[PDB]
Amino acid sequence: VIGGDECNINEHRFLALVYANGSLCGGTLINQEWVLTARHCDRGNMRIYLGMHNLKVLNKDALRRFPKEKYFCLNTRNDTIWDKDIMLIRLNRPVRNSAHIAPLSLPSNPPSVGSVCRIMGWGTITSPNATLPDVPHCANINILDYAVCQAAYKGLAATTLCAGILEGGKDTCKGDSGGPLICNGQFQGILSVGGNPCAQPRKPGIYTKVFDYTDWIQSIISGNTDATCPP
Ligand SMILES: *[C@@H]1O[C@H](CO)[C@@H](O)[C@H](O)[C@H]1NC(C)=O
Ligand SMILES: *[C@H]1O[C@H](CO)[C@@H](O)[C@H](O)[C@H]1NC(C)=O
Numbered sequence: 001v002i003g004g005d006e007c008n009i010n011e012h013r014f015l016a017l018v019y020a021n022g023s024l025c026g027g028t029l030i031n032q033e034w035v036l037t038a039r040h041c042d043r044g045n046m047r048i049y050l051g052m053h054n055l056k057v058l059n060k061d062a063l064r065r066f067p068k069e070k071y072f073c074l075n076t077r078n079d080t081i082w083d084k085d086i087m088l089i090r091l092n093r094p095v096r097n098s099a100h101i102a103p104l105s106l107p108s109n110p111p112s113v114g115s116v117c118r119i120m121g122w123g124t125i126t127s128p129n130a131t132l133p134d135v136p137h138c139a140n141i142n143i144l145d146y147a148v149c150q151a152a153y154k155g156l157a158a159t160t161l162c163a164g165i166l167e168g169g170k171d172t173c174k175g176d177s178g179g180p181l182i183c184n185g186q187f188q189g190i191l192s193v194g195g196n197p198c199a200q201p202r203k204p205g206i207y208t209k210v211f212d213y214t215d216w217i218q219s220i221i222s223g224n225t226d227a228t229c230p231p
């Protein structure tokens, strides 16, 4: 996250730290056994850490998990960038609520353009050139008119939200992918892609639009067979 500050230690109980093949991502605990992240974060041998804040001062209740179930959309476009960038993972064992662990559930509605959203992650706080923080950084950004992302980007995927600061300066960045966009207290986005360097004016982040995936998520977790992703 560029242009933010250290998150409050208590404001991200649903935030998962996802490590796969040395690559860093965020994720969101949506109930006691399941995490939503970006499918692009599935880079191999995934370890999912819950209840983490400082990577160098471990919360007493921090836990390590790995995927026991893993789902994503099988029909993805090839012409858009990271189409349907979402992956739903069931953890190997549940994680109970604790000081630093609690799920964030499914949004009741997609967010209005203009809504203030929190972004968060352990991703770089500088761009270009990686500077990885020991603590997750958080910033407030907004849901932007989708046309802003359409103007900034080539093959923008559908089922996405455009979020950032129109003038730049605050943004997610490398290492934050898969992490949540929380707007008005609701889990609305999973970071997929954005501009590099990060936080440029009119080059917002592209967040998979969680609301659109409600049926898919519920279908998978509720056990009814071979759900389908939204168009
Ligand atoms: C679609 O684009 C991806 C980029 O990730 C590339 O790996 C792949 O070769 C493309 N699909 C086809 C039809 O080759
Ligand atoms: C690990 O997997 C990712 C998949 O995207 C790849 O980028 C990376 O090169 C791999 N690392 C190794 C050991 O080559």
Ligand SMILES: *[C@H]1O[C@H](CO)[C@@H](O)[C@H](O)[C@H]1NC(C)=O
Pocket (backbone or CB within 6 Å): 128, 129
């Ligand atoms: C990091 O990359 C950027 C250009 O992409 C540049 O500003 C810098 O010279 C590189 N590394 C450093 C810190 O010197």
